[PDB]
Structure formats: structure tokens, C-alpha cells
Amino acid sequence: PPQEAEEPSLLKKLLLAPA
Amino acid sequence: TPTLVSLLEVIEPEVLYAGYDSSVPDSTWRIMTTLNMLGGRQVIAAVKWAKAIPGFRNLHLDDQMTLLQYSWMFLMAFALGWRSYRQSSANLLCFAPDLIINEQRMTLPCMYDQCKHMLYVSSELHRLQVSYEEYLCMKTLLLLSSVPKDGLKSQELFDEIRMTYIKELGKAIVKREGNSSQNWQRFYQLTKLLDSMHEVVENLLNYCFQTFLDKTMSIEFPEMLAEIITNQIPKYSNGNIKKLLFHQ
Ligand SMILES: C[C@H](NC(=O)C(C)(F)F)[C@H](Oc1ccc2c(cnn2-c2cccc(C(=O)N[C@@H]3CCOC3)c2)c1)c1ccc2c(c1)OCCO2
Numbered sequence: 001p002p003q004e005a006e007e008p009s010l011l012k013k014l015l016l017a018p019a
Numbered sequence: 020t021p022t023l024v025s026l027l028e029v030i031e032p033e034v035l036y037a038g039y040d041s042s043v044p045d046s047t048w049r050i051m052t053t054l055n056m057l058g059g060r061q062v063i064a065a066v067k068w069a070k071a072i073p074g075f076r077n078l079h080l081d082d083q084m085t086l087l088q089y090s091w092m093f094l095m096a097f098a099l100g101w102r103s104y105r106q107s108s109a110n111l112l113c114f115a116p117d118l119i120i121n122e123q124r125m126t127l128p129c130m131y132d133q134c135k136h137m138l139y140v141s142s143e144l145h146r147l148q149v150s151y152e153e154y155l156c157m158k159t160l161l162l163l164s165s166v167p168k169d170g171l172k173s174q175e176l177f178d179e180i181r182m183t184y185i186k187e188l189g190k191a192i193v194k195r196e197g198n199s200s201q202n203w204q205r206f207y208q209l210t211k212l213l214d215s216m217h218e219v220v221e222n223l224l225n226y227c228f229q230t231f232l233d234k235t236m237s238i239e240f241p242e243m244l245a246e247i248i249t250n251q252i253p254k255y256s257n258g259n260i261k262k263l264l265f266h267q
Pocket residue numbers: 032050051054055057058061062064065068094095096098099102113114115130133134137223226227228230231238244
């Protein structure tokens with residue numbers, strides 16, 4: 001698969017998630 | 020039209036259900052594990068709420084992570100205190116509509132210690148007859164009441180946001196009364212409760228971290244709380260925590 005920058009933190013994922 | 024306190028009222032997280040099973044007798048494990056799972060869901064609501072707080076998303080993402088990781092227990096304890104106050108006059112811990120911690124449940128092993136700290140927040144909210152608006156401004160202020168020893172990255176911006184909410188709390192106190200001496204006396208009293216929350220949460224987290232690291236207890240934690248707790252355990256020692264007090 002292609003290289004990715006998926007976020008491991010649940011908190012950071014919630015903070016980035018829209019909207 | 021629009022006030023910041025009306026915005027806080029609109030974004031106030033809903034009261035969630037525990038998903039508790041009451042057709043099987045009580046046990047400390049079942050209650051603490053359920054309150055842990057419910058707690059992770061309350062942390063999610065708090066992040067969603069912080070994102071809608073005017074000013075917060077202006078802070079750098081590391082500062083946003085930092086404040087929620089430091090304040091999560093203050094929010095949960097304060098909002099639990101508020102619900103227990105309005106619904107039971109601070110006699111019962113009203114965690115969820117389907118899970119109330121009454122006298123009987125408090126007597127369960129390991130329960131009372133963590134409970135007494137929660138009932139203190141509710142006792143104080145009851146004793147001061149805190150209004151809805153004062154509660155909303157106080158709760159925002161509890162998100163901005165602890166920062167690292169060396170500070171945040173968006174420090175000047177953080178200071179602006181906190182001042183904004185210190186002034187909103189002032190306006191909610193004025194609206195509730197209208198007497199200039201009683202105004203600052205009430206500001207003193209409300210701000211004293213905010214200060215005292217530092218110790219309440221210090222006791223809550225000291226028992227919480229013991230339970231998380233306890234291999235014998237077998238008490239489960241949601242993946243959201245498991246990650247915050249993993250970060251905050253080393254943050255207590257060495258002490259990278261600056262309490263932002265109103266008195267001392
Ligand atoms: C992590 C802790 N676990 C440990 O301490 C341990 C035992 F595992 F070590 C856990 O904490 C809490 C603390 C408050 C909790 C929950 C679950 N619901 N509520 C709650 C209720 C009302 C409002 C809000 C709220 O957040 N409301 C809005 C949403 C965002 O903002 C506003 C949150 C879990 C705990 C577990 C068992 C306990 C306990 C404490 O205290 C009593 C004895 O049993």
C-alpha cells in the first residue's frame with residue numbers, strides 16, 4: 001500500500017475530525 | 020444577541036446513558052467498569068464541546084491536546100457535581116439516568132473514597148446555589164485552569180481566551196444578583212470553588228491512576244481514557260503542571 005500519515009491518537013483524531 | 024453564555028448553553032454536552040444492566044445484582048467491578056466505559060464517551064463529548072468553544076480551535080493543536088489531557092477529570096467531576104446537585108440536592112451521584120450511585124452503592128467496597136470527592140463538588144455547587152449560567156462559565160474556565168510548567172505555545176492567545184471566560188462568569192454573577200459588594204463576594208466564592216477543584220481532581224486522579232495500573236483489580240478502561248491516563252501518569256512526576264488559581 002502507499003505510505004500514509006494516519007493519526008494514532010484517539011484524542012488528536014477527534015480534534016482533527018470534521019466538522 | 021449572541022452572548023458567549025448562550026453559545027455555551029447550546030453546546031453543553033447531553034446527559035449520556037451508562038448502558039447499565041440492573042437485572043443482575045450490584046458489584047463494584049460492574050459499576051466501575053461501566054462508569055469507565057461511560058467516562059470515555061463523556062471525554063469524547065468534552066472534546067466535541069471544546070471544539071465549539073469560541074477561541075479554543077485558535078490555539079495550536081498541541082495546546083488543544085494539552086488542555087484536554089490536563090482538564091478532562093475537572094470537566095467530568097464538575098458536570099457530575101452539577102447533575103447530582105439539580106437532580107438530588109447533592110445526596111446521590113447522578114452519573115447517568117440508568118446509573119445513580121445512591122447510599123447503598125456508595126457502601127460497596129472501594130466505592131466511597133472516589134465518591135466522597137464527587138459529592139464534595141456537588142455539595143459546594145448546592146451550598147453556593149450556582150445558577151446554570153455561572154456553571155457554564157465555570158466549566159469553560161476549568162478547561163483553561165491547568166497548563167505546563169513552561170507554558171503553552173499560544174500563550175498570549177490562551178490568556179485572551181481565559182480572560183474572556185473570566186469576564187463571562189462575571190456577567191453571569193451580575194445578572195443573577197446586581198449588588199456591587201455582593202457581586203465581588205460571589206465572584207470570590209465561585210472562584211474559590213474553581214481553585215478547590217485542583218485538590219478534588221488531584222485526589223480523583225490519584226485513585227484513578229492506581230486503578231489503571233492495578234493488575235489485581237481487573238477494572239477495564241475505554242481506549243480513550245487508557246491513552247490520556249498513559250500520558251498524564253508521567254506528567255504528575257516530574258511535575259510539569261501549573262495550577263492557574265484565583266486565590267492564595
Ligand atoms: C475515570 C474514572 N475511573 C476511576 O476513577 C476508576 C474507578 F477507574 F479508578 C471514572 O470517572 C468518571 C467520572 C465522571 C463520570 C464517569 C462517567 N460518567 N461520569 C460523568 C457523569 C456526569 C457527567 C459527566 C460529564 O463529563 N459531562 C459532560 C460531558 C463532557 O463535559 C460535560 C461525566 C466516570 C469513575 C469511575 C467509577 C467511579 C467514579 C469515577 O467515581 C465514583 C465511584 O466510581
